Every structure is written in C-alpha cells, then in structure tokens.
Amino acid sequence: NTASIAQARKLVEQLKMEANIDRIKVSKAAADLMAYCEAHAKEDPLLTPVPASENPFR
Amino acid sequence: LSAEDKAAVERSKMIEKQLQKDKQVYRATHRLLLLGADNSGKSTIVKQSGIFETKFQVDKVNFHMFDVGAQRDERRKWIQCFNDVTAIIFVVDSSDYNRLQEALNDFKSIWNNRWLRTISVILFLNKQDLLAEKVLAGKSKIEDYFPEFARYTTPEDATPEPGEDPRVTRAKYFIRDEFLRISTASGDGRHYCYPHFTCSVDTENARRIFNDCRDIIQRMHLRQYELL
C-alpha cells in the first residue's frame, strides 16, 4: 500500500545517503586507538596494579 | 565507621526487615503460565495494556495467573524469564474441528524447548457443550478431517459420563490420545503431561489445579530426596 511504498522510499533514500559517508583507512583508526590506549595507561587501576595507599576499595 | 554513617546502617537494617517480610509472601505464592489462543474459552476461565493478572484463593493457598495480550508471532523472545514458573496452563478449543493441528504444533514447540525443559504442562479442554451437538450431527464428521477414526477402539481405562453414546466418548478419547501421543515421545525427565476434562461454567477447576500442583510438588520433592 501507500505506507509500504513510503517505507521503501525511505529505506532507498537511507541506502543512497549511506554511500555519501566519509571513509578513511582503518590503519589510522587503529593508530588512534593504540595512542589512546598507551597515553591513558598510567591513570587506570586495572592493567597496572595500584598500591593499597591510593585505593579507597582497599 | 565515624559518627555520621550510622543512620544509614539502621536504614539498611530496616530495608532488610521489609525484604524479609516480603519473603514470607513471595516464597508461598505459586505462579503459572496461562497460554492459549483466540476462539477458546479465555473469557470464561479468566472471569472467575500489557501483562494481565488475576488472583484467586484456593484451599488457603495463594495462586498466580499470568496471561498476555500483546504477544506477537515470535514467542521465544520473552520466554527466557519464564524458567522459574511452576506449571504451564494450555487451553485448547476442541469444539471447532479445524484450528487443531496448529494447537498440536504449539504444544510440541513448547514441550520441546531447551531452557524450560523442567516445567510440566497442564492440559485443558473447553467448550464441552459445543462438542456435544457436533458429534451427533452428521455434518462435521471427524472421519474426513482425521482418517484414522476407522481404526480406534475406546480405551479400557474409561470413565464415561452417563447417558453418552459411544461416539461422544470415542471423540473425547480421540482428542485425549492425539494430545498425549506427542508427550510420550520426549520428556522422560522431571516433567509430564496431565490431561484434564472440565466444563466451562464449573467450580471444580480449583480442585484440578490443586491436585495437579500437589502431585507435581510431591514428585519433585521425592526426586530431590534421592528416593527415586
């Protein structure tokens, strides 16, 4: 019916607009992820154990 | 604990007191799953916009009935949170000779799931009146629907109602056997199937649920006690 036609048109427009999305190499994204992980590594009491002094859960 | 965080301690103690009070009601309340479909006797049984609930007192034991009114074709989505239920109520029409194979398919689907393979199923029958005038009338013969009517003998373990021709009890046990054939294949664990035969406008329903649940709980406890 008309509702199905409208839904199909909306999905067609969505798929057409899906093509006009900026694309960059995942290697750059992986580099940003690695930089964020390495830079924000000291201030995390999970991967690096912390002494019982600065630990309210101790 | 400095002299500030002590009111929270007594507040928490009061909260645990309320929770312990609620325990005495929650642990002594039995909940059931009430399945079914349209053209059945849902209105009659429920008369005694999401999830509905009805409360009834039976032999000084609280019981809980749960029926849904917004269930789509998919059924396995919200079935996950149904594992803690005690028994499952299934309602069939059994008056109209069509719309019956779908009921058997639904019964097999619920009976063969994996997550809820620890809940027994309570069978039911409705519209006993409409069945009566249909068997004695030579219009909707059941032979054309199911061609195995020509090979059927009334079981010896029969309790026929007085003043009933053999065709009526033959059809009743036809339905009972065709409903029990699927159940005897799988199972063999902690759950069984309990056929029941009660009218629509009747009060003996509570006795039936009472005896079914008592038998189920007794069997479960005896099994837990290693006796079986």
Binding site: - | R214, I217, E226
Partner: protein, 268 residues
C-alpha cells in the same frame, strides 16, 4: 530384665567387630563432615536438611568416639561416671535428631504445601533441648544408677534404663508408621506404569540415616538371643559407612556441587 547378651559362643567376634566397624564409621563420618564443611558456599548445600545431616553426623561421630574411649577405662573411677552421662546424652541427641529428620520427611512428603517455612529455631530447639531435659530429670533422681562394676556404662538392673528404651520405642514406632506411609505412597506412584527395585532402593536408603534398625535390640535383650546379635552388631556399629556411602556418593546434588567446586579450584 535378664541381659542375656553374651554367655558363651557369642563373646568372640563381638568386640573386634565393634572395633572394625567403629574405625570404618569414624573414618567415613570424618570424611562426610569435612566434605560438608568444604561444600558450604554453594547453594545446593544450603537447605535445612543438610544442616540436619551435618549435626546428626557430628553427634553420631562424637558418641562413637566417646564409646570407643569408654571401652578402655577402668571402672569405679570418677571420670567414668563423668562421661557416662555424656555418652547417654549424645546417644539420646542422635535419637532425637533422626526423630526430627523423620518428622521433616513426613512434613515434606504428605504435607508438601508449607515445607519451606524456615523452622531452623524449632528444629534446633527440639533437637538439643529434649536430651537436656531428659538428662536433668534423670540426674534429679538417678545418680547411684550411673556406674556399674562391669564397664563404664550404667547399670541395666536398677530400673534406670527408662530414659533410653522408651524414647527408642517411641522413635521406632513413629519410624514404622512414617516408613509404611512413604512406602505406600511410593508403591502407588510406581503402580502407574522394575516393580521391586525402587521400593527396595527407598527402603535401603531410608534404613541407616533415619534409624529403623534398632528394633533388633528388643529381641536381643529378651527372647532367643542366639542368632539375633550378629545382625544387631553388623547393622548398628557400621552406621557410618552406610550413611557416608549412600548420602555422600549417591546423592545427585552432592556430586554436581563437588564437580563445580573442583572446576572452580582448578580454574585458579
């Protein structure tokens, strides 16, 4: 009543068999107690019944150890009369504990509605106050009749045995009634289908942990005590082995909990 326990031809193979049975029972019961202590965090061993099993096993173990020590002790010496009352108290505690277990089974089988009531206080009270009341009412009047010349046990020819045989008969009668009812229920359940297999299994399971084997004592004390003492000793002294074996290696929930705990231990 005339004891007629062992005149000649039955004295041998009695103390040695008692020693062997007591050693096996104490080993099995200490294993059961350590298994229960280890397996207490998980939810399977968290119900009232397992607490009853644990305290009953502890009482039986301590009573058996006290009896074993009582075997090697000179008569007519103060510690003997001191520990005789402890012996009697522990035995009566075990009797009351299996009586409470039978009552719990009766409330669980025929009265399924209301089993989960959290009656821990009542169970402990009725298991540890009845022996105390019996002990105090006995020590009120029965003092001279608590040490004899033969061994450390109380004299059985003075009328002071009233504190044991009467509770024994009460427990045995209640046990016979409960067992008859449960066997009838099991037969009714099993009639809806191996005929003499599940009934025998149930009888064997309910025999040692609940205590229906004390009936033979009445026949042993009075009436043709020639052949009915070997069975008495064999089926009474080896209570440990029986309870341990059955309700620690055949219980389905115990094995699953032990496997889960082993998996948790091996994970770390």
């Amino acid at each position: 009543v005339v004891p007629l326990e062992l005149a000649r031809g039955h004295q041998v193979a009695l103390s040695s068999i008692s020693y062997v049975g007591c050693s096996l029972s104490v080993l099995c019961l200490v294993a059961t107690l350590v298994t229960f202590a280890v397996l207490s965090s998980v939810s399977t061993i968290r119900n009232q019944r397992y607490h009853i099993h644990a305290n009953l096993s502890f009482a039986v173990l301590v009573a058996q150890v006290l009896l074993l020590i009582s075997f090697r002790l000179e008569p007519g010496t103060t510690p003997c009369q001191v520990m005789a009352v402890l012996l009697h108290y522990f035995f009566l505690s075990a009797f009351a504990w299996m009586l409470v277990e039978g009552l719990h089974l009766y409330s669980m089988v025929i009265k399924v509605f209301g089993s989960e009531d959290s009656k821990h206080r009542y169970y402990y009270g009725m298991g540890w106050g009845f022996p105390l009341l019996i002990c105090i009412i006995s020590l009120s009047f029965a003092m001279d009749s608590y040490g004899t010349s033969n061994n450390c046990w109380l004299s059985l020819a003075s009328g002071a045995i009233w504190a044991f045989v009467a509770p024994a008969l009460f427990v045995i009668v209640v046990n016979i009634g409960i067992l008859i009812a449960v066997t009838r229920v099991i037969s009714q359940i099993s009639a809806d289908n191996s005929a003499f297999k599940l009934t025998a299994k149930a009888v064997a399971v309910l025999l040692p942990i609940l205590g229906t084997s004390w009936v033979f004592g009445v026949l042993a004390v009075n009436g043709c005590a020639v052949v009915f003492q070997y069975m008495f000793a064999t089926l009474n002294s080896l209570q440990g082995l029986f309870i341990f074996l059955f309700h620690c290696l055949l219980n389905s929930e115990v094995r699953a909990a032990f496997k889960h705990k082993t998996k948790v231990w091996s994970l770390t």
